[model samples]
Target: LEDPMEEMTSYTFARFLRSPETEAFVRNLDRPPQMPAMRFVYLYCLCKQIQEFSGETGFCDFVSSLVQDGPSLKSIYWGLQEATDEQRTVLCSYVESMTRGQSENLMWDILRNGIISSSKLLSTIKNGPTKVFEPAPISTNHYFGGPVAFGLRCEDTVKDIVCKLICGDASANRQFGFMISPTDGIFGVSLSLCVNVESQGDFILFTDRSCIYEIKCRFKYLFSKSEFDPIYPSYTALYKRPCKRSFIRFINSIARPTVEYVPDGRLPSEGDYLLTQDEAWNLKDVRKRKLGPGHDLVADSLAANRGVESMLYVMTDPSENAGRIGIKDRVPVNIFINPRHNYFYQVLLQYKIVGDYVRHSGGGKPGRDCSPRVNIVTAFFRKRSPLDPATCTLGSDLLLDASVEIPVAVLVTPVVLPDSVIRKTLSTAAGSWKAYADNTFDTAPWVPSGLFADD
Candidate 1:
């Protein structure tokens, strides 16, 4: 109902070159001009040229090939005006030579790199945000060069005869009735498309193909008002957003925090045991469980915390009881790393490991070492570049690498073991159990000495 292209500008037209709509519009344009179709054709040609060169290669080279055979500037105009069936065929051939190679190259690159990597071009389109451009129908005939082989036909509903010839049952399918026509009539228009993606060891591959067909419709009126001009206003308005600010917001949204645990004023007692990384890694049958089932451990521990009625402890060494530090609060565990590395290298850590053991532990079982381990994981952030030509450098040399960071206290979870287990484990081997804290040194001094030496 609304004019989709009222907002159309040179910039917006450039964006359409990368849209599925471009193919639909181009296929329909094959029929001769009725009213002022030249304007639509001109914009289509311009956008198509932009699409061809917009990739890693230069657009100027594509333009040069069109001009090398004849006056470059008038090449597009002449190709559209040729009369006689033979002339039309030649003109189509010329146009095909100029635009076809680039289109195929771009398509292959897209299949390989995926829409996420080369997203800038599609991002330029207003409706492109949803990632829903219907892919060009795939074809098996190598002769037509895949999508290039197909054409489109548009008929007006008011003109009954042409409508009947082009599209049967005009009223049944009338929303500007049209069909995706192919060059050969034998392969009629019920085309289907398929895509396959596969990964082998370190390599990834993607392949796509389609069916084909032809047209057998007659015309009532030679032409109808072209709809292409009014269907894409959003593309022009999108250029107003700046790239740097968008990138900043994107990166910050994904930033994660890191924290280090240390004892606070508390001292280690005679019977307390300190935990080691090996003890933490081997505390449970880490190898037997799921690859990353640390969450299960945390869940078990939380259940244990709820079961405890109260907390109590007796000091064996008087010096250890001076001032004990317990978990002040719960924090989120997150992936962290040195910001110096590329954003791609940042890792994510599991919070469950810290959260679970702090609340509960299984009674001593042979080979079931219950020592806690501290491991770190990294997180990554991503941002898209603005489509503005001045702001975004078009070539590879100008591309920017995404930024990364490991923030402070962003998502760190701390754990504290129960005093009962500490005493039991230490009783078996007095010097075997060692204690350490995030805020304090070798031993916690606040721990009353009586809990360790005399208990």
Candidate 2:
């Protein structure tokens, strides 16, 4: 094989694949050594076999040529003989350590020489195959406060909010995920977060919860929109400011075309009368205040010199022929005056008689009636307020439409006072008047000592 003219033919390579002839000659080949032994000659033969068959070479190529003579028994034998005992033992031990394979010699050497120093074999086994990570084999429960007064967990509240938010096709189980989380919203308030989980092939992680509610409300186009629009502003105003009044005005404006009003049918003779000083002073002797005049009137009262009545009527839009205002489009108008205003008490008294007129005028009772009846009359009109708040000027203007239509079914519900309540109210007034007879003023208990008292 060492002859210069001889070629490395397939025949020569085939002979190289056979077990080493040198191993047959060794007496201690099978006999176990005291410390360790490396069969370099056998490793060389196996490497040559792999290279011949596979035609691929790597670490096997390095093991095949341990010395310049190229893995022959003679070269390996003489190579060991040339080294000192310390070098010979060290080289043999290194080879023997790698031969007890956790991995290939190439990988073992890489792990051993590089950053890895402790137990290279163990490291080799760790990197042997790829694997995916799974969660730990344990579970944990977390507790949190609910949004409502009831004792509920955070998860439970989230489930309910999500249940309500779900919309669209039911067959596909079209649903959304809502997370009630504490955020820096409205003084650290908890909010519901909506995730577009079913978003066609792709989805957003988060969106505004209220925006979703409103967007869906519009998309569906139902009675809910009409109902929700009126009060939605007030709910949001709890967090932010200034837009509530504007929202109410806008909602009312949309329904403006459908609203109509009518005269409450009372003559001028029954209007409010100016009481003389003697008449005012003798009021203490009166046991109960009568319902100022116009006791027979139902639609409007004459005491305050204003008409008061409420009726639900559908207003047709002028622009469209054979078309009327939609139920969803027309808002139910209501009148709410400040309860503390002087006119409010006057209305209450007027309402008391007006309600009885409606109930009794239907031929229920006629003589000396003592039953108590209260009613509400909600009026709507165009109001004008000055841009300057300092003036405190306001006006309620009547609609000046050329044609008027009759209203049907009054929308205002009667607020009836109980018989005992009316009696007790009169008794309390009588007691207050008895105090006044003794020259005591319980209503204005404290005497004013300033110029504003007369002003």
Candidate 3:
């Protein structure tokens, strides 16, 4: 047992806590995660019994060969605030089939492999470096083909965007998974994605709206034959991109920035007034008729459903004087998806004031009062034309819905997450979800079991 060698100098992260048999297996967790199969499953069974009973090379003193155990392993790994919020939606309905593993067979490999740990595809954003674009619009003097709604669901699109970094008709929650666009983000389309789920990972924070530089990514998926990596919990951090100077932001704090609508180029001229009857229409002409004050203030801001009160960055193709600004940092609102079929992105954001646009009713209401109300988070993602048809489609115009408008103040909740601490989950799977659809449990009756299956 004379296992003690000199530095080969490889282990990183503060020299992996200056190894002394991995710093007494993390100071023996000093009372950790209230037993997930006992004190961190004895920290991966004491790092694989001191790396296979110490033939130790770069230091490995001893752990008395981690007194092992495992007969009826009572389901472990749950303590990042131990499954309370409605059981973390049945444990994140298994975040895209939460990993099952053979991880790196140095041992710790019988079924409960690494005690069922899970996570991947994490994200973050809210109030980050924010100046508040959506500083308003969960509701307004509603109109525009009568709009305002929100029924989205891509697993609550990251909690309907952290309730848009939350705040309200005065409601304040701003937990810093930050996001704010409108004003400070004239069409640079500000974006935020914060996905904190810690147990030692997924703490990200990203904010964008014309900021700049910095991108750090170094992943050594390990397991290159020993020093076992098994994709170290799917690494990836330090993303950080959003820089600035009043406007050079995104000019990569990781870029949540999104938007692309290039109608080819060179139209709307005669010095442009109230949108061009001062006249040109070109951006590659396909707009037949009934629409032109150049693009009709985009049809009077989607029929004044409350879209523009200032801040729009349109440069689709100003004949290649090419500074080409795509939302600059970002806040180009419009997300009512339902494209009929290009893989229909399941949507809704038209009900902050529900149904009917009106011959008369819905508009002219928040009325005879005044200005100073600029809310926004009106969603709609209409416009799809790029599956790499060899760069910028010489042909790709498949249109449907015409509604368009944009605004912001904050409060973009309700992609089905409005006061839902998610009271109920498992619409299926629990106890066979309707074994009464009939005979299951393999035809009932505690049936046959070859004594716990040696079959």
Candidate 4:
């Protein structure tokens, strides 16, 4: 924290912007518009800090001091000048990527969050490259089976509670098959299961040589390929899907929340846990359940089971009854919420992993992400309310995202994962699910007899 740009140290962004040097740089960039030159310069400083002290600090804390104070043109300019040519190249490289239609804010995230450090949990490797697995056919099962729309396991670390909910055996699976699960309605907070897609590792992305391989699980022959889906080639992207390294950072959120959304605060009863053909698919039930909540829930379940490889999310309706928590901060309430968002509206929450930001170190600008981000969604998707971390206030120019103001909590947790592991999607056959429970193995895809998502 001391002497940030030591070779170049100064207090605040305002002063730096006022200085002739920043004046020149800010002016040099395209119109500076909503994003300013100082912001970019601050980003450069942030990257410098990450290079040396990646963990041991929180980004929000540093920026709190950063934005309030001044930067000497000498300091800002000298910091850039003091750098090695390679380091300087990153800044320009970022800009060029942005020029080609990448998000400047997204690039800023890579710097602000810093490089994610390595971990023992992630040590499993295939020929020197760390392995990241996403189900090829990519199917998922609800973390807790069902009922809780918001969060079912709600922070479940309890031994008795943790052991049974189909979880990932990371160590066993070589960091490849990690996952979490727990039943719902645990506390005042509701942690419902939204989407729980499970898939066998038909495809694998690895770190060593930056390559992907497809193998028909048990047969074990390798078909190498990355950046494009071998199974469904239609949505190919050059820098598509989360790379091995990125997925390692984000794998934790894929599990069910150790935790609720509800009119009835009870464990998700048998048939209600996983959707029933009659309960969800039937026309009458469709009308009764309603689409936003119904379609989203079923879609989430189907996606996880099919291992569709999409993000998981939830639907939230705010509470006024005894269960609601503390009061909202005045600054956020009026600034972020709207008339429709007045009472608790049915909000959405998504998750991602970024630089720890608070490691001895350490962690969007968003649109259904599959790119590097600062967990921008986290700032908005946190426990209480939504707003970006660096943004302390609001204005006509600084309005929050349309769906974020009254965001409901995301239903995933960090640190601890679920105990039991899942093999494939749960079955909804007519026999007692108790009897059906005996059959589950990832190698075989569950082909529900009734109309299903793939259909």
Most accurate candidate by lDDT:
2
Q: For model 3, where is the 10-residue window of minimal lDDT?
A: 116-125
User: In model 4, where do residues sit more than 4 Å from their true spots?
Assistant: 1-24, 31-43, 49-288, 292-455
Q: Write the per-residue lDDT of candidate 1 for residues 19-70, one digit (tens) a residue.
A: 4544343445544322112222333354454444344222233333333322
C-alpha lDDT of all candidate models, in order: 0.22, 0.25, 0.20, 0.22
**Structural RMSD, model 3:** 24.0
- Residue range with the least summed lDDT across 10 consecutive positions in model 4: 180-189
C-alpha RMSD of each candidate structure in angstroms: 33.7, 41.0, 24.0, 26.1
lDDT by residue (tens digit), candidate 3, 1-455 = 34221121133212222445433433444343232122222333333344454443211111122222322112222232232322222222121112212122222122121111111000001111112111222243354221122221111222232232232111211122111111110011111222221121321112111111111111111112112333211111111221112111211111221211112121322211112121221123343333564444223322332222212222121112121212222332232111111111111111110111111121233444211122223222212222212222100221212221111111121122111111111111111212221242121111111111121
Error of 3 at 412 (Å): 10
Off by over 4 Å in 3: 1-68, 74-323, 328-455
Over the full model, what C-alpha lDDT does candidate 3 score relative to the true structure? 0.20
- For model 4, residues 364-386, the per-residue Cα lDDT tens digits are 11343221111101111222222
TM-score, predicted candidate 3 vs. hidden true structure: 0.22
TM-score of each: 0.16, 0.19, 0.22, 0.20
**Backbone collisions counted per model:** 75, 1, 71, 61
Q: What lDDT tens digits, residue by residue, belong to model 2 across residues 241-264?
A: 223233233223443212111122
* True-vs-predicted CA distance for residue 360, candidate 4, Å: 30
